[PDB]
């Protein structure tokens, strides 16, 4: 009869090709609810350890009790909104209008950009306001970049640059909010955007694995029984029926696996601190020591240690926030042994 069975692997994360930017790019942003604010931040993955927590869930029969929870440590030092980009609404979607930059630049931002030497901030600002007057102003986002230098364990000094949306009350109000952030020096921090307890969406470029078989890549079976000894162990039965006489792209085949962007949904921010309270004895394997601004993320995060990961207020949360959870213990035990 041939029993039924779901297909192997999702056809939603394709094509399974190597990512274009190691730095993730959100294709979604939260809704314009609260007061004006930057809708995202970034850090650099460091590692894992567990934390003991007080059951924060009001519906848990264990609410108030001890509870061990896995946590991935992420160094989230301050970042810098170096300019405000404006978009206009056109018959072909949104298009970048202009940009308002600054003069105070991080000593090493030029390892990536051809830093500006002559820019007219006001004119840009004007152009934007005239577009808003005309009513063609599309959302507003800030060009942001990180300060790798600020993170010793991470070799790179060349900053990673990524655009982040600014959703606020009115457009006029948040437009201003934008300009103000920028004008200063763009300097902002995880505290300014997130609060321990809230849910965030963590994007990242997964750990690369090179070319792999379908078994690993799509999760197809290995030849079973007598079939496994005939000369085929990890190759599927066939590439398709006789007709249509062509191999469909839906059939699991070998290829690039890993080093793909993924936006993992609803990640609870256990704690946002600073210092070396989360670091492990011996140091974070293949990473280093943590002693500065950090975020503790519940569970796992895509990517290997040292990789840049991006945060964003969960766009589709299931639970209501349960602010500042009681941390009763953070394990610093060595990750070697």
């Amino acid at each position: 009869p041939q029993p039924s069975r779901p297909r192997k692997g999702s056809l939603g994360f394709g094509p399974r090709k190597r990512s274009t930017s190691e730095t993730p790019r959100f294709n979604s942003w939260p809704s314009d609810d609260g007061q004006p604010g930057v809708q995202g931040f970034a850090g650099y993955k460091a590692g894992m350890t567990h934390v003991v927590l007080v059951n924060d869930e009001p519906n848990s029969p264990r609410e108030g009790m001890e509870e061990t929870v896995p946590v991935t440590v992420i160094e989230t030092p301050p970042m810098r909104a170096v300019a405000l980009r404006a978009y206009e609404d056109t018959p072909y979607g949104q298009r970048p209008l202009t940009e308002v930059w600054t003069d105070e630049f991080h000593s090493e931002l030029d390892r990536t950009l051809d830093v500006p030497e002559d820019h007219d901030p006001d004119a840009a600002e004007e152009q934007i306001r005239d577009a808003h007057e005309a009513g063609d102003l599309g959302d507003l986002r800030l060009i942001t970049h990180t300060v790798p230098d600020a993170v010793p364990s991470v070799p790179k000094k060349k900053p990673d640059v990524m655009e982040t949306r600014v959703g606020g009350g009115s457009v006029s109000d948040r437009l201003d909010h934008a300009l103000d952030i920028v004008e200063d020096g763009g300097e902002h921090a995880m505290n300014d955007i997130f609060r321990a307890g809230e849910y965030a969406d963590v994007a990242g470029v997964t750990k690369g694995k090179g070319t792999q078989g379908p078994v690993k890549r799509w999760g197809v079976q290995k030849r079973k029984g007598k079939h496994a000894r005939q000369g085929w162990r990890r190759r599927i039965g066939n590439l398709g029926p006789w007709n249509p006489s062509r191999v469909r792209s839906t059939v699991p085949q070998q290829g690039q696996t890993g080093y793909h962007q993924r936006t993992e949904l609803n990640k609870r921010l256990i704690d946002i601190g600073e210092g070396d309270e989360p670091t492990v004895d011996g140091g974070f394997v293949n990473y280093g020591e943590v002693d500065g601004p950090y975020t503790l993320v519940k569970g796992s995060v895509p990517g290997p240690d040292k990789r840049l990961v991006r945060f964003r207020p969960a766009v589709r949360p299931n639970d209501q926030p349960r602010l500042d959870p009681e941390v009763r213990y953070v394990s610093n035990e060595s990750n070697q042994g």
């Binding site: 567990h50 003991v52 061990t68 213990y329 394990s331 035990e333």
Partner: protein, 53 residues
Amino acid sequence: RECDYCGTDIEPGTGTMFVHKDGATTHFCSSKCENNADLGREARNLEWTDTAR
């Protein structure tokens, strides 16, 4: 808690508790201990063991 085998403190959110036939309970801090036990060895006779120490 303490390892009912070697005697060192068992890092919270770690370890295994074996439940014996009779109903006795034995918390272990690591596989190393567990395994040395299954060999029939006693913590006292193992110099690395806090107990023996």
